[PDB]
Amino acid sequence: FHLTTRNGEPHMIVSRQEKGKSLLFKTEDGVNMCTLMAMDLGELCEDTITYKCPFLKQNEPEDIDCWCNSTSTWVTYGTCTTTGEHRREKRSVALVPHVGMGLETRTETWMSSEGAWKHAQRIETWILRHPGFTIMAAILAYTIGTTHFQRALIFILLTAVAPSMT
Amino acid sequence: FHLTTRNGEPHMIVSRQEKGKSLLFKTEDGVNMCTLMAMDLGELCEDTITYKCPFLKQNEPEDIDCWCNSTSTWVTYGTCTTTGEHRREKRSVALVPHVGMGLETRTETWMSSEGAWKHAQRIETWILRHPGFTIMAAILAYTIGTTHFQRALIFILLTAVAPSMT
Amino acid sequence: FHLTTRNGEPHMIVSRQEKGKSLLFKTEDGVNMCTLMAMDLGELCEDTITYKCPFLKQNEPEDIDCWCNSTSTWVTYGTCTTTGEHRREKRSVALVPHVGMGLETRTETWMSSEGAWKHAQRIETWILRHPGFTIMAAILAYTIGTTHFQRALIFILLTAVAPSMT
Amino acid sequence: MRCIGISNRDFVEGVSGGSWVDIVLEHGSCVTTMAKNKPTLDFELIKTEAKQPATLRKYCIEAKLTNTTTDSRCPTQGEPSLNEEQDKRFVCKHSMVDRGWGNGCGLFGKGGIVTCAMFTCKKNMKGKVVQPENLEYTIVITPHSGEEHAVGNDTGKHGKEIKITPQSSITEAELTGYGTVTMECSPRTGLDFNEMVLLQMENKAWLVHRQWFLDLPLPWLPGADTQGSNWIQKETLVTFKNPHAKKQDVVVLGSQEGAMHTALTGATEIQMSSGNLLFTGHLKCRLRMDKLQLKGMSYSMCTGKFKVVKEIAETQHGTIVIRVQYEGDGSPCKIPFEIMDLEKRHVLGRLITVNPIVTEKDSPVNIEAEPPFGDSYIIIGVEPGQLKLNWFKKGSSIGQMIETTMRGAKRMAILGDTAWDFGSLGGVFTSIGKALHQVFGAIYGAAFSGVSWIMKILIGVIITWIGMNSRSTSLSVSLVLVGVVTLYLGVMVQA
Amino acid sequence: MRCIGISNRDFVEGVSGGSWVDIVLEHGSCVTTMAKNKPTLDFELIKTEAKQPATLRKYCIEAKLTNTTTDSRCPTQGEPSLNEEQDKRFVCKHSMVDRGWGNGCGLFGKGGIVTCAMFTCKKNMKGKVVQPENLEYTIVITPHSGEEHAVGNDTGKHGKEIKITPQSSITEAELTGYGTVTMECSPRTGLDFNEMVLLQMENKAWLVHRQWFLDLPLPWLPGADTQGSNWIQKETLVTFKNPHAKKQDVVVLGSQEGAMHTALTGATEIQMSSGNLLFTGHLKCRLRMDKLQLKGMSYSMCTGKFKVVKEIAETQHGTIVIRVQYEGDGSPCKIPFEIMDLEKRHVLGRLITVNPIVTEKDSPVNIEAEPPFGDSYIIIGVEPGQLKLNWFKKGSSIGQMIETTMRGAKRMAILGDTAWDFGSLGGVFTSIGKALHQVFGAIYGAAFSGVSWIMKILIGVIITWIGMNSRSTSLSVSLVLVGVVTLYLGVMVQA
Amino acid sequence: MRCIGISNRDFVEGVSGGSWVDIVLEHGSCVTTMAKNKPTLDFELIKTEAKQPATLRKYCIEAKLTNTTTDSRCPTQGEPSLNEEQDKRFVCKHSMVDRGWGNGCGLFGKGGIVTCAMFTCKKNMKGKVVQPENLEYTIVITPHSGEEHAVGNDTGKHGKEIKITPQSSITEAELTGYGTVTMECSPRTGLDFNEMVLLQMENKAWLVHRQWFLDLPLPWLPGADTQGSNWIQKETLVTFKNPHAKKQDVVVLGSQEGAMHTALTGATEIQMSSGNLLFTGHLKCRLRMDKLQLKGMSYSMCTGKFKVVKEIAETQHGTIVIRVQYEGDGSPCKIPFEIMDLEKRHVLGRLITVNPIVTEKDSPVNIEAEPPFGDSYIIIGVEPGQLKLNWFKKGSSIGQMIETTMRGAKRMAILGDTAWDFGSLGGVFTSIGKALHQVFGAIYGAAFSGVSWIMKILIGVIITWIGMNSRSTSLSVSLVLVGVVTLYLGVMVQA
């Protein structure tokens, strides 16, 4: 409850030595009878919370932490626990990355089943997602193709080459 | 207060006629003085908040309203303001209404894919929404195009052009 | 503390020389005990703010900065800061003056000249921002279109649609 | 004659197969029914209401909170359970909070909390759904007699108001002098009703959509529910502040009534005093006319003099009003009202009120007429001293041709598939005649000679003979169809 | 002889039938006027001024709030009625708050409040709108006489500076020694100064668009009024807060001087103090130069010895400019000056200063010329004392052809509709001759032999005759048009 | 030889006269270089590291705080200004709260509160960027001397380590007992670096895409700053309890190391403890083995006792690795090393370590060799004491043929565009020759007879003639290509 002045106003620093008890002083203004009704007042810390106890003459206090029946004043205290810590822990912030690529390398090789079938799976996925381009390629094959074998070969070539450009 | 046996334990009802001061009472263990650091206290009414006051021996009281020196108990009190009315605050949210059922539009947009498919979707929406212009474009293509594929070509070009100029 | 008669009612002019002290005086209306309680008061200057101070019947002083209990009266005073400067806030309103021009200039020579130039630049951008479509459309028209008018339609329409399509 | 200034108006002139008019009735619209040897009538609707509504779901807006309990147990000590939880009348939550060795307990860790409280609620909505059955419709019938309070009057004694409900379909209404006319219809050919629900608060009401009515996240009550014990989604009105020590300070959300006034406004507003304004949805109705005859016909024509009080007023449908006053003597009497063309020879114009009568001398009658767009003479009275009031009527005859034909076509089209009686064998002829007479009937009546039916059916059979023995088959199909329509529809018109 | 050095050199080398020559003038773009047997000239607009501005509107950049009264009434009593509401001197508003049994009134309800205050305007922000008729165009006119103190100069004064006021269309600028040239030069046919506005603050100013100038959500006072009481756009600065009970924290925003200065930064700052130096605007200048005459033209061919002081330095457009001295005698005297081929057979180039004159002993004399790209011999004087000066200049002839032709085409396009004489009968052939000159005269005079006019028109009629009797009509049209162009512009260029 | 157990063991079966072999190299993959009668090499990269990385942007992880204050004014006084808030060293916010009439200033209304504190934080990320310049590669070169501690040994002091970087081009390295090899390397093929970023936490690291840093909402520090006082997006860590009249306590987010570890999982973890193993990009390293001497081809022939210690430790390629001890005297001497068929008719194996030599008595030697496919006999020593070891390799002939040709194809694929020497005229023929070798030379030397080159080139020209003089053009194109490849590749293989 060491008292100083800042911005022309009194400024008492309270600690656990006087906790949950009526603060009392004698100042130029008069008999200062403050009630520090706050919550997180523990032993003094470095998380220095500060407060204006507002001047209240006779009215019904409410929705305040600390007040004084003499004059407005500043009060301060800490918030860390008894053992010593910053403050109460929480878990928050939303975040997640992409997921990687490694020990696979990005070129058609290795004869593997997955690598071998990836190209065909991507072709058929493109065809399913691109029916219009498939129909257009079929129509071009029909027009240009004089024989059914050439028709099918050109259709397959177009359907396989169009995605590879992307 | 009224030291009753609620749930098989001591139970008190503190009102606003005394406030911000330690209570005193008697139990089988002896005289008990009770602290009540509840800052949001009002006078007794229907809105009765209730506690189970702990028991502390010598440790620092932290992050709690109530405590005694000998035993636990159950302290309760009202929260009505000076006018005697319940708690009071605003607002919440209600979905803004409107006329007609809107079920044609959900999900947000991928910029690249939707930009790529904007032309394909726009031609379809436009050609559907204006059958009259479909008829006129078809007639013009029918007249101008000497052979079938010229007619189809002119038709598809005009159908693609018409949304673009708009 | 200076009383006048405006609109058939008293008007009270108060200065900071009687700041922070209850409004006490005596007139034929009775013992006009009254109070001013807001701290917006400034020294006497030209920034005159007014009030009507209501009349007590039974209620506690509430909802009004002033409060009289003998006869409703109008209280006015000064609000300028101690340095003789009117109240003011730092918030500001403006817009962006860099670039704006929708439609201007004479009626006809501008119409002809800017039409020629805007069409020239638009078509020229379409022909250089997307060149290959132009030459392929030109050769396709020259090969397919039966008459020079038909060929003109073909490649002009293709050059119109392709750069918008692409 | 309360349709002056009413934009939507149809001059339906005919009788259906069972001698029942097929009213199309829409809020803010008019119907006027005509037939020869049949006094004209005016058919209107003035009020729509729903009674005995069903409570789809009750919403209670303002929530009061009482008897709130909160308790906690340290980690590993247990999870508290209270009998207050078992009773569903409370809203309850479980939670986790840190405790500690120095924090009034034994060790560091997350111990459990249960906090819950009663949920009373005072102010409440009332949301109700309206079925087709529960509706009641206020029809009003007016006679075209030209009485002074029988023109553009919303509270005149001349009109008779009846209510229509499905539970009493076959009903009989009475019109002064003319007699008994039959009420019978099921108006359910309109827009679907299951998609809408009406909220009401004290006095105001709002029309909204069912899914929206159920979406609003507040407490519920089933329709039969009235005890207040059960409550669904009761969490939202009761905000639990952050977990804290042994406490969960329960905050009671404020009345959203202001919020509802802020949101619902903009939607379709309704006031219960005027009844529900469910103007959406056409009302098809049957209405028999067989039990009515001409009242006042026995009164002889009077050969006195006729005077005009008000000038030739114009309505929004090419129709003329004349306040004819009788300075002579011999009242009451059968009004001679006629039309002639420039050659003073042919009766071409169409009259509205057949055999008008005068109640008493010095009390003029509001005759109503519909000449064709053009020049004609309204002949009031008979010579000597006749009054051949000239009258030029703007518009194009093809104008009303297309307009009336299209309006009747759409009227029978919305009342098309599954509406007009096609199933009845033998009555298929009557239904075809009905379709023509609702659509093509104006062709028979207005443009084609007025008409005296015998001479025009002779002309029609002549036209059929010419069309059959014509030089072109296209003209044959174009002309014999019109001729057979004329003949058969004239036979129908006679009925 | 004033604009040797500026980048926008332009040449007009044609005359009209009635010598009604037409020029365009822009900022920094001087013009040189050529003619046959008439003195050549240099024209420029030196400074644009906008005198007698019109006070369009005014803004109160900063605000003072005084005499701020306020009153209220309990619910159902209506709004209070003071005397400040009617008077526009005070800006004010009314609103409502909940008052009742708690705070003096009877019942809790939305009672009214009126909140008024004097708005005093400390500082102004001036707006100036320039109309077309208010542009005072300062035009400098300088002959190619032989002066010295104008090359690469701004104040160099041997000619005349004239302030053209568009109210005064015709004006006589008496050029010393040569007479006068009629000034019929309008800015009306230039770009419309309809959307340019000047913001003025103390002494500094900026230029900004009209729509932007008026869009500003600031205090808004008209030009006509002086007292400022008739005040518009009230709520820009007075920002009343939500009224609790009666008082509301009425406060005018801070001075906008800093904020609007920061925003306006980057716009076109104008150092108005030295005049309204507008950097845009065509001046369309029609001139009868027949009144003008060259007193120096007919003096005797000059005999004595003749020497050069300074050697050539290139110009921007690439023109010969020589300072030359005359040691001989016989002043005043017409000085020979030709640009011969290196074999002294046929002439290549052109000289600007027609008939240069030396009317003073022991003085520099400025001689101007413009060879083609190629070796040439400037031959000066007559033997004894012949001077031959070899010269060469870089570039491609086609480069100058395309440059001059396109420049003239743009000049005619801007000097186009409403500008070139199409309504004047008789001069129509002259006007089209002028136009065809301004487009194709570079090709005619440079590419096509220089030219000896008689023989080239003979060739012109030959090409016309071959075109008309050609094997193709497309070639006929393509060739006879050029041939008639050649013939008509040969008849013209002769003048 | 070092590389045993590494799955990706690439081969170079042969050398040419130019010897400019461009080896491919990749993480976790060794390479073996053969050369006719020259020392056989093993290449690896043991460690990739980008020394002296640059710092992009630091992120905060654990926030201390202090000097937290809450100032406020009554409504209608303007939210107070603070000396606290004007400095970037703090973090702060303004908010609005309903101060009531009992709450100090008795004028209930919503007013401003300024809340804020100091923000210095303890643990912080280290974000870092790697440029192509800083890429330092660590290359290990080993001879096939067969020293004992070679199988499953990497850093053993038997070969050479060189610190290669693109900043360096040429540097000689010494292989003890086998001469010199020039590191004229070319680390050209960095995969991509614009969108990859390195992260460090105390004693661990990660690799992550740049956008992940650019978008992650946590406190910032640009790389330039050093005071740790200016921060951007500093408000995200502080989360404010709901305002409480004048109380407004600030709290932050606690230990984020756990959140980082659980969320970042799935990204490329890098074991920075042993330095930053950057598993990215291939190495395209040109080596010329012209000046690399072999010590022992001139030694005598081994004639003593012969004994095996351990049998084959079967490799992924089924490559015999015989760890064998020769008690016989006479060392140094050349070892008998044959790989023969079941019947023991002709040899068809391929020994790896050319000139297997024992440097000293009573010492094991690890001989590397690749036998044919199927069953076979390994012949070590000479009779008497001739040693025979039966062994089978499971691979199929055409199988291993196709996979080894595919390994060569991949090696040329990465050693593709811009890599193979196309610019060098004259050497273009040699480059295409070496390409045809590195693809088809397995086929050439293992399938097509082994080969005695003279007779096979004779057969190849015969095949070429038959293909050219064939009945079908498709067969001609198919066969003459094979023939010319055979001829030219044989000429290359001879060299």
Author numbering:
A (entry chain D), B (entry chain E), C (entry chain F): 1 to 166
D (entry chain B), E (entry chain C), F (entry chain A): 1 to 495
Give passages from the manuscript.
The icosahedrally symmetric, immature particles contain 180 envelope (E) subunits associated with the same number of membrane-protein precursor (prM) subunits and internal, core (C) protein subunits. We describe here the cryo-EM structure of immature, small VLPs (smVLPs) from dengue virus type 2 and show that they have octahedral rather than icosahedral symmetry.
In our octahedral smVLP structure, the segment that connects the pr domain and stem-TM of the prM in question allows the B-subunit stem-TM to form an approximately twofold symmetric contact with the stem-TM of prM associated with subunit C—that is, to orient the stem-TM about 180° from its orientation in the full particle.
